[PDB]
């Protein structure tokens, strides 16, 4: 199909024509530019179905994302040598020869920014020096109403009319005195670097890849330096100790739906292999007709990695830089609240409403915001919208390998309970003991007798439901093909159309099949343990204590009344079948706990909320026969788990590789070598 492109620099719209021209002389897709003056018109046009893609820096991606356009990147550009490629460019502050000024004293000095709301000219620098402008700004936006701080200042693209300072030093010579154009002699890193070479001002706010990209005379370096954050100023090329923001890189965008990661990634990979770094003289896609820099694309850059089908603007832009792009346009007595509200993330309605009751009693110190499945509750705890949740070990893996940490862990009551323990907070965790229970009515079945039968387990991707059993069955078989194992099976959270979600029933009307929330009757521990006892599959793989808490009508409902514990016995690895009461001897394996995952932001704070509105207000110790009941309660295994007889003291295992145990990480790395996951691969993109 005809794939378009949205220029912004139409005088320099020649790295646009040359593209389709010396691609049509090869064969040519029907490309064209649809020019405008400012980029925002391009974001509009693409949202307005008028163009396909234009690359944006940080702040512009943010503005291009939120409603009502919802733009999504596809291809994150790569910066560095063809041997060692990365996509994390930096933003630094260049100065005069000696200068004698540090970044903390810029009162009246004559600055040179690079463009309104860009992450090396405006957002990062402002946020860096924001504790100095001191603007009570519900009225009086930042632009200059508080950028009186500097007396002289150049900031292209600024509204020339409103404020006097923001393009004085911008020598635009006419109505372009202030413009966001290609004809502003002080616009890009090169212009807002000549705004320091000309000595007209001192502090340039630009990338790290220019001091060597436009200073060919390699003796003129030792005077220009980089204004560091750490109260000092170090020589230029040591920038891994002097840079100011590990921002992400200009990332070609395209619409939310029909944005075509595929089409433009295809033509872009052809061009990446054909016209990339150090190649033919047929208009490489990285170069410049001398006089300008980064001409409506990027220059001095090798290529662009592909951004997975999971990443959308909030995820792409990081977490630090996203909190920073937001908490400047809201007042200091507002965005100091957000750093004290533990926005909790539930999964599915029922624990959302448990969470709302909590929010009510919380004293306004714990709000709530929910999601549908732990994949998406992660996709929230990432982009800032909810700073906590709790999940079963296999999910501590799938999450920690997305860049989070475990904070506390549901310290289950291990078999050696023997008492009510008051110091339940600081008794380090013990994992759980995952077993494979079966009904001794049928006596033929042995260990070798698992394949091809009817059997249902407790969860997908959790440790005791889909990865300790099927891991060992893979280690014996070798065919990591997961539906061929069993004839009919109820594993909650897989596809619903397979021969692997045929033995599930769902909800009341019978619609929510295998959905990983609490609406799939046979989901979760008691869920699989329903699927078995109702006699539709043979072997169940579940945590042990459930076969202990589903006799004597311990669920006093229909299905768990009338049942006896002398009616099921365990499996083993040999083939015997002993009595369940001592699963300490012939279980299926050990496994790690669940745990409360969160971010490195707000982790000294989730030791000030959860530590004393669970230890108190909290199921054994101050109230809740009546008010809170945040555990085994009126509700069962929602938002926690109903053996959660405390919350933990994780004791150092922040780096989950230090938490999950080096053996289970090995297991799940052996497993997820045949099975991908919607998240894991995108989030392994987000560590490149």
């Amino acid at each position: 199909r005809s794939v378009q492109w949205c220029a912004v620099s139409q005088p320099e719209a020649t790295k646009c024509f040359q593209w389709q021209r010396n691609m049509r002389k090869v064969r040519g897709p029907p490309v064209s530019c649809i020019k405008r003056d400012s980029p925002i018109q391009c974001i509009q046009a693409i949202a307005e179905n008028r163009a396909d893609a234009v690359t944006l820096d940080g702040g512009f991606i943010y503005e291009a994302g939120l409603a009502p356009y919802k733009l999504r990147p596809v291809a994150a550009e790569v910066y560095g040598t063809e041997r060692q490629p990365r996509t994390h460019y930096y933003a630094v502050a260049v100065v005069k020869k000696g200068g004698s000024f540090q970044l903390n004293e810029l009162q009246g000095l004559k600055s040179c920014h690079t463009g309104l709301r860009r992450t090396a000219g405006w957002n990062v620098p402002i946020g860096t020096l924001r504790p100095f402008l001191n603007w009570t700004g519900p009225p009086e936006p930042i632009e200059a109403a508080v950028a009186r701080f500097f007396s002289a200042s150049c900031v292209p693209g600024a509204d020339k009319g409103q404020f006097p300072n923001l393009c004085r030093l911008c020598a635009g010579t006419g109505e372009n005195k202030c413009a966001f154009s290609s004809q502003e002699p002080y616009f890009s890193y090169s212009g807002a670097f000549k705004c320091l070479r000309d000595g007209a001002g001192d502090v340039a706010f630009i990338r790290e890849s220019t001091v060597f990209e436009d200073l060919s005379d390699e003796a003129e370096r030792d005077e220009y330096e980089l204004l560091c954050p750490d109260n000092t100023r170090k020589p230029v090329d040591k920038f891994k100790d002097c840079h100011l923001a590990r921002v992400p890189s200009h990332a070609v965008v395209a619409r939310s739906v029909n944005g075509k990661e595929d089409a433009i990634w295809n033509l872009l990979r052809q061009a990446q292999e054909k016209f990339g770094k150090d190649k033919s003289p047929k208009f490489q896609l990285f170069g410049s007709p001398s006089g300008q820099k980064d001409l409506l694309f990027k220059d001095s850059a090798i290529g662009f990695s592909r951004v997975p089908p999971r990443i959308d603007s909030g995820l792409y832009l990081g977490s630090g830089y996203f909190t920073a792009i937001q908490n400047l346009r809201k007042s200091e007595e507002e965005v100091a609240a957000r750093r004290a509200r533990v926005v909790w993330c539930a999964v599915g309605e029922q624990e959302l409403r448990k969470c709302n009751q909590w929010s009510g009693l919380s004293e306004g110190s714990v709000t709530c915001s929910s999601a549908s499945t732990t994949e998406d509750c992660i996709a929230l705890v990432l982009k800032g919208e909810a700073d906590a949740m709790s999940l079963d070990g296999g999910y501590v893996y799938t999450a920690g390998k997305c860049g989070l940490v475990p904070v506390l862990a549901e310290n289950y009551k291990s078999q050696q309970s023997s008492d009510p323990d008051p110091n339940c907070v600081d008794r380090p965790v013990e994992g759980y003991l995952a077993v494979a229970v079966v009904r001794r009515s049928d006596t033929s079945l042995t260990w070798n007798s698992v394949k091809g039968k009817k059997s249902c387990h407790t969860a997908v991707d959790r440790t005791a439901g889909w990865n300790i059993p099927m891991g060992l069955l893979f280690n014996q078989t070798g065919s990591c093909k997961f539906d061929e194992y069993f004839s009919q099976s109820c594993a909650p959270g897989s596809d619903p159309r397979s021969n692997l979600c045929a033995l599930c029933i769902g909800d009341e009307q019978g619609e929510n099949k295998c959905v990983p929330n609490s609406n799939e009757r046979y989901y979760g521990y008691t869920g699989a343990f329903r699927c078995l006892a109702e006699n539709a599959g043979d072997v169940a793989f579940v945590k042990d204590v459930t076969v202990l808490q589903n006799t004597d009508g311990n669920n006093n409902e229909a299905w768990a009344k009338d049942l006896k514990l002398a009616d099921f016995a365990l499996l083993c690895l040999d083939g015997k079948r002993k009595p369940v009461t001592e699963a300490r001897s012939c279980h299926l394996a050990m496994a790690p706990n669940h745990a409360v995952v969160s971010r490195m932001d707000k982790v000294e704070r989730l030791k000030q909320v959860l530590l004393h509105q669970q230890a108190k207000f909290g199921r054994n110790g101050s109230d809740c026969p009546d008010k809170f009941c945040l555990f085994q309660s009126e509700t069962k295994n929602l938002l926690f788990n109903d053996n959660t007889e405390c919350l933990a003291r994780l004791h150092g295992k922040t780096t989950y590789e230090k938490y999950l145990g080096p053996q289970y990480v090995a297991g799940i790395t052996n497993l997820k070598k045949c099975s991908t996951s919607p998240l894991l691969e995108a989030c392994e993109f987000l560590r490149k």
Binding site: E349, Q350, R353, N356, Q357, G360, L361, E363, G364, E508, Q509, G510, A533, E534, N535, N555, N556, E557, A558, W559, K561, D562, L563, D623, P625, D626, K627, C629, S633, E634, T635, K636, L638
Partner: protein, 532 residues
């Protein structure tokens, strides 16, 4: 609370579970604001129109609350009973954003969970009559909706144990469709034995118990017994639990269903054959609003006194001419009921009606009109059958009464068009020889001249340019009042199914129900009381 109608619906009972005081602190001893809620009686949300329109009114109310949510309807069970006219179903939604109202100081004072919905029952064509001889057996289901207390035992045990999915029963109205212990395919059936010898109706109301492994036969526990007393179309009476509940299950079912409904069970047979059944009730502590509905066994053996129409003989009718001409039947309350009343009517705007002399209130007929497709002029015949106890077919009757003629769009005439609202009939009971005068211009001879309206068995053709036809019907005390319509208006006519050459019984948009005739252009509806 027993003023019956076509369709009712109670709305779920969302309880105010917001701890902190309105403006203060946490209503002093640890409680919520509304720590109980029984029902009221400004809530039976009467409905009207087509079943789909009633359902859609409920739907639109929930929509008026919120517009993104999805409604979990009732259909996916009720097919199991193959209903045709009456339904006792449910609507609800659990996609709701709960109502929060906070205070300035951060505190909160109102919190209503999002679960929103109704239970409802809807009937069509109330049974103007009933099977008469022997007993009859209906099968069908019910639905209920309880109050919403906060501790139905005093231990706050999980609201999953006692029956229902979480948060139902303890913080909102415990309900039926959200009950999840039964023979999960069929939860709540019920059976109906009706005996007209004593004009009574007994019924058993059953909640299927639970089978561990989904193979066994059911364990039916009858939860509500029904003793109802007939009154034509409707029936009043009492819903009350059995005692097996109170004895065995004093912790699971004796804890919602625990007070009778004395004189507070209403219902109506629907289908003009009394072959389907609707009803409702509310337990006398206003704690269980429940609506039920059943249906014939489809093996309908006829009754010997053929009261219920629909493959038997009509007894009482409400006949209404449609919009501007044709005639139709409007479903029958079974109730008798207007000169220059300049007040509103249920049709939408200000009825300026003129219906004269009221020395006969049993049968009614004549003119209904209403001023602000359209509705211009209204002829009605609302006539109730005779009470078959007063005065038998031995005697003599002289009827005088009401009369009204219509022609269509051209200028029409009134009761005094005969120079007097006479509609005069002479008949002998012992011979059933209805005759008399229904004047067209003046007298008997300058009118339609057909007489000797004998009655054969139940059927009849009382009559009072050859080969004409006129029909009537009995009203008041036993054979004591008379009246009907001329069966000679146009190609079609007035009264019973239109004589329009008998091509298709309204199987299309043409209306070609019954037998042919010739085309004059004049119609009249008549009635009269006995004199002696």
């Amino acid at each position: 609370v027993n003023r019956p109608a076509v369709g009712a619906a109670m709305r779920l009972l969302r309880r105010n579970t917001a701890f902190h005081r309105e403006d203060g602190t946490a209503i002093p001893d640890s409680k919520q604001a509304e720590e109980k809620l029984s029902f009221k009686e400004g809530d039976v949300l009467f409905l009207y129109g087509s079943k789909g329109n009633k359902l859609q009114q409920l739907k639109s109310e929930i929509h008026k609350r919120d517009s993104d949510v999805e409604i979990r309807t009732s259909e996916k069970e009720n097919k199991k009973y193959g209903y045709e006219f009456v339904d006792a179903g449910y609507v609800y939604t659990k996609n709701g954003k709960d109502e929060i109202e906070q205070n300035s100081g951060g505190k909160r004072f109102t919190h209503r969970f999002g679960y929103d919905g109704f239970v409802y029952y809807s009937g069509e064509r109330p049974s103007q009559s009933l099977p008469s001889a022997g007993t009859v057996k209906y099968f069908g289901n019910w639905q209920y909706m309880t109050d919403a207390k906060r501790h139905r035992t005093g231990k706050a045990v999980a609201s999953d144990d006692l029956g229902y999915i979480t948060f139902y029963g303890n913080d909102i109205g415990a309900t039926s469709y959200a009950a999840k212990d039964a023979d999960d395919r069929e939860k709540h059936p019920a059976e109906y034995t009706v005996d007209f010898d004593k004009k009574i109706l007994k019924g058993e109301l059953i909640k299927n118990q639970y089978v561990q492994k989904k193979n066994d036969p059911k364990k039916p526990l009858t939860i509500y017994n029904i003793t109802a007393d007939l009154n034509g179309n409707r029936f009043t009476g009492s819903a009350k639990v059995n005692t097996e509940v109170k004895t065995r299950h004093a912790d699971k079912e004796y804890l919602f269903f625990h007070t009778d409904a004395d004189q507070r069970l209403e219902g109506g047979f629907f289908g003009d054959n009394g072959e389907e059944l609707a009803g409702r009730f509310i337990s006398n502590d206003n704690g269980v609003f429940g609506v039920f509905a059943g249906k014939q066994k489809t093996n309908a053996s006829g009754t010997n006194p053929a009261m219920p129409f629909g493959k038997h003989t009509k007894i009482l009718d409400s006949l209404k001419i449609s919009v501007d001409f044709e005639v139709s039947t409007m479903p029958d309350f079974g109730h008798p009921d207007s000169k220059e009343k300049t007040i509103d009517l249920a049709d939408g705007r200000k009825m300026t009606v003129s219906a004269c002399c009221d020395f006969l209130t049993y049968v009614k007929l004549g003119r209904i009109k209403t001023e602000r497709k359209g509705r211009d002029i209204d002829l009605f015949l609302k006539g109730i059958r005779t009470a078959e106890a007063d005065i038998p077919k031995t005697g003599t009757a002289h009827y005088t009464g009401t009369w009204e003629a219509r022609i269509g769009e051209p200028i029409q005439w009134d009761n005094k068009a005969d120079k007097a609202a006479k509609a005069e009939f002479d008949v002998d009971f012992g011979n059933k020889s209805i005759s008399g005068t229904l004047t067209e211009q003046n007298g008997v001879e300058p009118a339609f001249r057909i007489e000797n309206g004998v009655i054969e068995g139940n059927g009849f053709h009382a009559t009072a340019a050859d080969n004409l036809l006129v029909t009537g019907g009995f009203y008041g005390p036993q054979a004591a009042e008379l009246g009907g319509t001329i069966f000679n208006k146009d190609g079609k006519s007035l009264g019973i199914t239109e004589d329009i050459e008998n091509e298709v019984e309204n199987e299309a948009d043409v209306g070609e129900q019954l037998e042919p005739e010739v085309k004059p252009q004049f119609g009249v509806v008549f009635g009269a009381k006995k004199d002696n």
